[PDB]
């Protein structure tokens, strides 16, 4: 989540005074080209480099990726609620995430670089096959980056991470 290795160059800027959502691109400082769901949405020629998605109030969502002098970065699936993507479901105060690639192998999860859904010692965090359940979802505590990966593989090799921000 915090790291860009594995071509996960797009990150959410966590330091806004106003409820605006800014994306950053960790690529060779030159000319950044931004994309959303495959189509180009911007071309930054020097000067600015961060991409503004607007206020977090309009629930920005989509597969965003950037590109400098090299190839496109992997996407960062943004999902606000104030290639097959992660499915997000909200029911009352419960947030359910569904892993995009579930070949029947053991699916593991991480939230901001920390494993979750493993220990049965948590009544509010359950893992059932390709589904991660978060009961009594805490906006300021559980929002952030999520990723599912099969046992044995590196999380960084995931096709893309999910950035979840939800007020419940």
């Amino acid at each position, epitope marked *: 989540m915090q790291s860009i290795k594995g071509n996960h160059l797009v990150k959410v800027y966590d330091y806004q005074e106003d409820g605006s959502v800014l994306l950053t691109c960790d690529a060779e400082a030159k000319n950044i080209t931004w994309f959303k769901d495959g189509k180009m949405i911007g071309f930054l020629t020097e000067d600015k480099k961060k991409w503004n998605l607007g206020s977090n109030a309009k629930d920005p969502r989509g597969m965003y990726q950037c590109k400098g002098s090299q190839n496109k970065s992997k996407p960062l699936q943004v999902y606000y609620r104030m290639q097959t993507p992660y499915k997000v479901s909200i029911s009352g105060t419960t947030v359910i995430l569904t892993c995009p690639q579930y*070949p029947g*192998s*053991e699916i593991l999860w991480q939230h901001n670089d920390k494993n979750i859904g*493993g*220990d*049965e010692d948590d009544k509010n965090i359950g893992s059932d096959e390709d589904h991660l359940s978060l009961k009594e979802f805490s906006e300021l505590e559980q929002s952030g980056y999520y990723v599912c990966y*099969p*046992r*044995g*593989s*590196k999380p960084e*090799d995931a096709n893309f991470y999910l950035y979840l921000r939800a007020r419940v």
Partner: antibody, heavy 119, light 107 residues
Framework: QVQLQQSGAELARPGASVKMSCKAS????????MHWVKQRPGQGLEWIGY????????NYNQKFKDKATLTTDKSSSTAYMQLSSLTSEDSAVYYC????????????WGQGTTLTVSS | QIVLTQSPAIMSASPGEKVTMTCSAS?????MNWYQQKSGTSPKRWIY???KLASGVPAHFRGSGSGTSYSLTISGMEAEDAATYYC?????????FGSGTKLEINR
């Protein structure tokens, strides 16, 4: 201080079944998957499968499906592997080993259990 | 599924020589491990995550590689380095081992 103590050598007749053990200590037993490896005389290593002691999740090498059955006993921190419908092809040394996710490898291995299948 | 072809299958090196053994994967893998096994004993974790040496492993050992080609190097063969080395991957299911390289010490 991680230790994996496997059960003693065994002799079983063709067609029978055998259950061997691996007693772990020195780490949180339910926190790491336990794997089993097969090594025939003068041969290489072969992966059988693994089990997650947490809730009993298991996965197998297709070649060992229905031949090997992995189980664990939390209260005794012991993993078990049962081999059924034995033949001379099953005679070999069997190792149990802890998979340490942060290092992506089997970091600690049991001393191994030799299985002889003969009449 | 993923086949790991090790070469050479058998080799011997005089003390002090630089030994290089390779592991070629049939498909790309993000990392490779290496286990050392000496006669009559269990395999030992030797090199993990491609290039990290397990604690206690002589520093003159080195692991490297990427994609479909990996190798283990011994810079300055010592008698105690003689053994059989197996590479292993788990970037794709099922987890698989290479057939091993048997290394003898010349004298």
């Amino acid at each position: 201080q991680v230790q994996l103590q496997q059960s003693g050598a065994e002799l079983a007749r063709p067609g029978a079944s055998v259950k061997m053990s691996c007693k772990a200590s020195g780490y949180t037993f339910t926190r790491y998957t336990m794997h089993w490896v097969k090594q025939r005389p003068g041969q290489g290593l072969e992966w059988i499968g693994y089990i997650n002691p947490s809730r009993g999740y298991t996965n197998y090498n297709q070649k060992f499906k229905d031949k090997a059955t992995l189980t664990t006993d939390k209260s005794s921190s012991t993993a078990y592997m049962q081999l059924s419908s034995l033949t001379s092809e099953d005679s070999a040394v069997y190792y149990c080993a802890r998979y340490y996710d942060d290092h992506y490898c089997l970091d600690y291995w049991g001393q191994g259990t030799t299985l002889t299948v003969s009449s | 599924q993923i086949v790991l072809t090790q070469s050479p299958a058998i080799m011997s090196a005089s003390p002090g020589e630089k030994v290089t053994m390779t592991c070629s994967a049939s498909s790309s893998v993000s990392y490779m491990n290496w286990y050392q096994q000496k006669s009559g004993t269990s395999p030992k974790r030797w090199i993990y995550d491609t290039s990290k040496l397990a604690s206690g492993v002589p520093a003159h050992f080195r692991g490297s590689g990427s994609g479909t080609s990996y190798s283990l190097t011994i810079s300055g063969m010592e008698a105690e380095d003689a053994a059989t080395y197996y590479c292993q991957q788990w970037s794709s299911n099922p987890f698989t081992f290479g057939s091993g390289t048997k290394l003898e010490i010349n004298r």
